[PDB]
Design a protein around this ligand. Structure first.
Ligand SMILES: OC[C@H]1O[C@@H](O)[C@H](O)[C@@H](O)[C@@H]1O
Ligand SMILES: [Cl-]
Ligand SMILES: [Cl-]
Ligand code: NA
Length: 472
C-alpha cells in the first residue's frame, strides 16, 4: 500500500517557457527580461549561454508531446511566455502567433491523452513592464490580471489546471542582486519585498478574475507554485527549532500565509522582525510593505490547491547573518548544509529525501492539509544517460511522498518531475542538467533521448507503484 499511488493521483513532467522554447524574437514575440539578461550580461551566465534556441520547443513541441506519451505522463506542466502572447506586456496587442502556438501544444497534448497544466508566470516578464520597475511596482498586479484574462479566454476551455506564479521566492531575488536572476537589480531587503507584495496582489486578482469571468463555464482550478527547502534544526534545541520555524515563515509563509490561512496577511514573525530591524537601522517606515484589512480579506482564500517545488534541505541554527538589509538577515536563521548529504551538480541542491516528507507535514499542519500538487522535484548532474544519481533521487523522493500520503495523511494530488528534458538552467546555462531526457545542444535538431531516469519513471507511471528493487 505505502508503495502504490492513489488511483486519482496525477503523474507527469514539467518545463518552463524560457528554459525550453527558443524562438525568442520569432513571429512577433516581444523581448523579456531573460532576453535582456542573456544578451546584455552574458558575464552573469555560465558559458554566456542564452535561451535564444534552448530546446527549440517553439518548433519542436510535437517532439515534446511524443516523449511525454512515451513516458506515460498524465499531465504536462508548462508555462506560457507573456511576451509571446502580449509582446508589449500590456493587453493592447495580442500576438496571434503566440495564441496559435499554445493552442497547438494544448491540442496536441489532448489528442495524445495528456492533460495540460499551465503556469502563467515562470520568470519571463516582458521588458516593457520591467521598464516601469517590474515587480516592485504594484501597477503590475492589474497588468497581470489582464494577461490572465487573455489566457483564460483563449485556453481555458481546454486547460483546467492553472498556476498563477512559479517560485516567487526565487524570482523576487532578481531584485536583490546586481549580478543575479533577471532583472539583476540590487535592492535587497527592500525591492524584493515590494516584488513579493505585487505578486501576492497579482495572484489574488487573477484568482478573483477566474471566479468572476470564467469558473462557472470552465470548471478548472487555480493555484500557485511555491518553492521551499526543508530546514532541519542543527541541534534539537528549542532555539534551533525556532530558527527553522523562522525559515519556513520567511520562505514559504511569506507567500502562503496571506493566501492559504484563514487569517491571511504576512506571518507575524515576518512583520515583527522586519519592523524591528527597520526601526533599529533608522528607517521611518518598515521595509516590509503592508496589506490593509480589506486587502487581507481579498487575498486570503484565493486558492484551489497549493503547488510545491521541492528539491532539498538546509540545516538551521539560532542566530542572524547576512547583509543589512536583506531577507536572509531579517529571517533570523544561520543556514548550512551537512557534508554527509549526497551532492548534485548544483551547489545549492543536496539529496535529503526525508526532508520532503518533513516539509509536506509542515505544510499539512500550517495550512490545514490543502490539496498539494508537487509541481517540481528533480536532480542535476553534468551529463550522461546512465543517471543513477537521478534515478535514486526520484525513487527516494517518491517513496517519501508516498509515506506522507499513506502514513501521514497529507493530501498530495499530483507530481510533475522537473524536468522533461535538459534545458536552460537560468544563470547556470546548459551546464547543469535536470532532464529525464537528454538534449544535444550542439545538434540543431535538438534530439531528445531517454536517460535511465526516464525509463524508471515510465515504469513507475505504468505500474503506478515503486518497483520492488527500489524499496527499502
Ligand atoms: O533550479 C531548478 C528548477 O527549480 C525551480 O524551482 C524553477 O521553477 C525551475 O525553473 C528551475 O529550473
Ligand atoms: Cl542535539
Ligand atoms: Cl526486481
Ligand atoms: Na484575446
Amino acid at each position: 500500500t505505502v508503495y502504490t499511488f492513489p488511483d486519482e493521483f496525477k503523474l507527469g513532467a514539467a518545463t518552463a517557457s524560457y528554459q525550453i522554447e527558443g524562438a525568442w524574437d520569432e513571429n512577433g514575440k516581444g523581448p523579456n527580461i531573460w532576453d535582456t539578461l542573456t544578451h546584455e550580461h552574458p558575464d552573469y551566465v555560465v558559458d554566456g549561454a542564452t535561451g535564444d534556441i534552448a530546446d527549440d520547443s517553439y518548433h519542436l513541441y510535437k517532439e515534446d508531446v511524443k516523449i511525454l506519451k512515451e513516458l506515460g505522463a498524465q499531465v504536462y506542466r508548462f508555462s506560457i511566455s507573456w511576451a509571446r502572447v502580449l509582446p508589449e506586456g500590456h493587453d493592447n496587442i495580442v500576438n496571434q502567433d503566440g495564441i496559435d502556438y499554445y493552442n497547438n501544444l494544448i491540442n496536441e497534448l489532448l489528442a495524445n491523452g495528456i492533460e495540460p497544466m499551465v503556469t502563467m508566470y515562470h520568470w519571463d516578464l516582458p521588458q516593457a513592464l520591467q521598464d516601469l520597475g517590474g515587480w516592485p511596482n504594484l501597477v503590475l498586479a492589474k497588468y497581470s490580471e489582464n494577461y490572465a484574462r487573455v489566457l483564460f479566454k483563449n485556453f481555458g476551455d481546454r486547460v483546467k489546471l492553472w498556476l498563477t506564479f512559479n517560485a516567487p521566492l526565487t524570482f523576487m531575488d532578481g531584485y536583490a542582486s546586481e549580478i543575479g536572476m533577471a532583472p539583476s537589480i540590487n535592492t535587497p531587503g527592500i525591492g524584493d519585498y515590494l516584488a513579493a507584495h505585487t505578486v501576492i496582489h497579482a495572484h489574488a486578482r487573477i484568482y478573483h478574475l477566474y471566479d468572476q469571468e470564467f469558473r462557472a463555464e470552465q470548471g478548472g482550478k487555480v493555484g500557485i507554485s511555491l518553492n521551499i527547502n526543508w530546514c532541519e534544526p542543527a541541534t534539537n534545541s528549542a532555539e534551533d527549532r525556532a530558527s527553522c520555524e523562522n525559515y519556513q515563515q520567511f520562505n514559504l509563509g511569506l507567500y502562503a500565509h496571506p493566501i492559504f490561512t484563514e487569517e491571511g496577511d504576512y506571518p507575524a514573525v515576518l512583520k515583527d522582525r522586519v519592523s524591528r530591524n527597520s526601526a533599529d537601522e533608522g528607517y521611518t517606515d518598515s521595509r516590509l510593505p503592508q496589506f490593509t484589512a480589506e486587502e487581507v480579506e481579498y487575498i486570503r482564500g484565493t486558492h484551489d490547491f497549493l503547488g510545491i517545488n521541492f528539491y532539498t534541505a538546509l540545516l538551521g541554527k539560532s542566530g542572524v547573518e547576512g547583509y543589512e538589509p536583506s531577507r536572509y538577515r531579517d529571517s533570523g536563521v544561520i543556514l548550512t548544509q551537512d557534508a554527509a548529504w549526497p551532492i548534485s551538480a548544483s551547489s545549492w541542491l543536496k539529496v535529503v529525501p526525508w526532508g520532503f516528507r518533513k516539509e509536506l507535514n509542515w505544510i499539512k499542519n500550517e495550512y490545514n492539509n490543502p490539496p498539494v500538487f508537487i509541481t517540481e522535484n528533480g536532480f542535476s548532474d553534468y551529463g550522461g544517460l546512465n543517471d543513477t544519481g537521478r534515478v535514486h533521487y526520484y525513487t527516494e523522493h517518491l517513496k517519501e511522498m508516498l509515506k506522507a500520503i499513506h502514513e501521514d495523511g497529507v493530501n498530495v494530488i499530483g507530481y510533475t518531475a522537473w524536468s522533461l528534458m535538459d534545458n536552460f538552467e537560468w544563470l547556470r546555462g546548459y551546464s547543469e542538467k535536470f532532464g529525464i531526457y537528454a538534449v544535444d545542444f550542439e545538434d540543431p535538431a535538438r534530439p531528445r533521448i531517454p536517460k535511465e531516469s526516464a525509463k524508471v519513471l515510465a515504469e513507475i507511471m505504468n505500474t503506478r507503484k515503486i518497483p520492488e528493487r527500489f524499496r527499502d
